[PDB]
């Protein structure tokens, strides 16, 4: 609730903006519009592109790579909006950038932004973060 303070990850509620995996989420948590933490809501199309971040998990004290993937082809959900930017780099480092609509690869060429999932794709490990 102080927006400029260091972000304090928690591991007890995925719908809140301070959930540890949402460390570089930009948009809306899919779990608030009929998705789940790592699945898209009905009617949306799951992109194959992602932006990645290394997110600290307060629970096991380990750092996980989160490869955010967008659920596309619906107007933005309006529910549980969140913008965090841990390790987030500018657009010219697109692998870590999150203003970009990462809807590439989505079925039916769906490119509109509805919400984002936060699946873990590895441990590791970044120089910038």
């Amino acid at each position: 609730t102080d927006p400029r303070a260091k972000w304090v990850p928690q591991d007890n509620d995925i719908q809140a903006c301070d959930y540890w995996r949402h460390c570089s989420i930009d948009g809306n948590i899919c779990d608030c519009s009929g998705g789940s933490l790592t699945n898209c809501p009905p009617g949306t199309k799951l992109a194959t592109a992602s932006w990645v971040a290394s997110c600290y998990n307060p629970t096991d004290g380990q750092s996980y790579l989160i490869a955010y993937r967008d659920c596309c082809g619906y107007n933005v959900s309006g529910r549980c909006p969140c913008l965090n930017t841990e390790g987030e780099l500018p657009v010219y480092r697109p692998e870590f950038a999150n203003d970009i609509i990462w809807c590439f690869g989505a079925e039916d060429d769906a490119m509109t932004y509805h919400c984002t999932i936060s699946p873990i794709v590895g441990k590791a490990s970044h120089h910038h973060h």
């Binding site: 998705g35 790592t38 009617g43 993937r69 619906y74």
Partner: protein, 376 residues
């Protein structure tokens, strides 16, 4: 106790610790059931709008459907599909208008039909559920047109095509009673029965006049298709009930939602969907509050529940929030849905005790319309 987001965090934590795998994919919404509820957000006349598909029992958003300008949602009562008539333009709110009907699968939410409506024939109005309506067999959708004159559009959902416009008298709303028949309310104070074929002048029959020119019938009457019960409050909480189950209109005795002392003390209905009707309980629910007589679209904080047969008051719940619309689940121990356009929140109450049970917030910009299927 434990929120959905908290239960989710715990389960993900446990999958992570167990090395449990799982494919990121597109969810299916859970099977439609009686505690499913749909909230449509006309978004105060925005050019694009949202409907939220909600599990009333968990208080959970299970899906969403996009729509265009003031769409009309319908929900098939048996749960097999949902649909809306909707309006888009080539350049957001400007250029070529396309009116169309989409039918959706209720689990995947994918459109299974997209039916163009010739010559942009939809009535653009703040959303009245009974301005677009499914026939009881779910095969036809009827939509009202106002301009250039009152008319009703017939859309074949099974064959996925627009059929025809029907000329009607100076009447409004559409309460289908049969695959080929619906009722409208006319400016003269009668109901018109309209029976239509594929071609030929509809057979239009008027009932008797059932109200004086100075009793005003609200834009959001409750109608239970399966009961054929039309429940039509006036501005004063006088309730007309018309029984359409015979196929012809039978006028039921009028009841008063408010007592004479309440009325003398300024109690009146008000809101948007001011009235709900529970078919199995034969119970009417009315949004009421103390208000001046021309404040009839403002929120209300009380629901009176009265027996539709006797007019006896069973409860007066203090909702505790500013409620514009109500509806009920049609199962037994029903839920009472109380949507606040101001709060953008659906409050989910126990219809028997009036207790708030849970709520779903962040439902668009100005959500106004609640729909449930009557699946029982």
């Amino acid at each position: 106790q434990e929120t959905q987001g908290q239960a989710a965090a715990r389960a993900a934590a446990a999958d992570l610790a167990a090395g449990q795998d799982d494919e990121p994919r597109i969810l299916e919404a859970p099977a439609p059931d009686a505690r499913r509820v749909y909230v449509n957000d006309p978004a105060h006349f925005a050019a694009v709008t949202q409907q939220f598909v909600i599990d009333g029992e968990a208080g959970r958003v299970i899906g969403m459907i996009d729509g265009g300008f003031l769409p009309n949602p319908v929900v098939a009562d048996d749960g097999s599909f949902i649909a809306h008539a909707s309006t888009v333009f080539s350049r957001i709110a400007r250029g070529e208008r396309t009116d169309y009907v989409e039918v959706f699968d209720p689990v995947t939410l994918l459109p299974t039909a997209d039916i163009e409506l010739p010559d942009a024939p939809r009535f653009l109005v703040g959303t009245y559920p009974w301005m677009t309506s499914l026939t009881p067999d779910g095969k036809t959708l009827l939509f009202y047109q106002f301009s250039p004159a009152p008319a009703v559009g017939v859309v074949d959902l099974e064959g996925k095509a627009f059929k025809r416009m029907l000329d009607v008298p100076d009447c409004y709303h559409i309460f289908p009673t049969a695959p080929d028949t619906f009722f409208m309310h006319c400016r003269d104070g009668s109901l018109a029965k309209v029976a239509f074929g594929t071609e030929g002048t509809p057979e239009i029959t008027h009932t008797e006049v059932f109200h004086p020119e100075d009793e005003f019938l609200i834009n959001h009457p409750a109608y239970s298709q399966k009961a054929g019960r039309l429940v039509w409050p006036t501005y004063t909480g006088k309730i007309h009930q018309i029984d359409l189950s015979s196929g012809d209109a039978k006028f039921l005795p009028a009841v008063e939602a408010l007592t004479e002392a309440e009325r003398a003390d300024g109690w009146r209905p008000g809101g948007w969907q001011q009235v709900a009707y529970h078919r199995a309980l034969d119970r009417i629910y009315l949004l009421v509050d103390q208000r001046d007589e021309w404040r009839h679209k403002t929120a209300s904080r009380f629901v009176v529940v009265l027996d539709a047969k006797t007019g006896e008051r069973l409860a007066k719940f203090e909702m505790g929030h500013e409620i514009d619309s109500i509806n009920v689940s049609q199962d037994e121990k029903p839920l009472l849905y109380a949507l606040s356009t101001g709060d953008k929140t659906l409050y989910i109450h126990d219809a028997e005790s009036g207790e708030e049970l849970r709520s779903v917030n962040q439902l668009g910009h100005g959500p106004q319309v609640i729909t449930t299927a009557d699946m029982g």
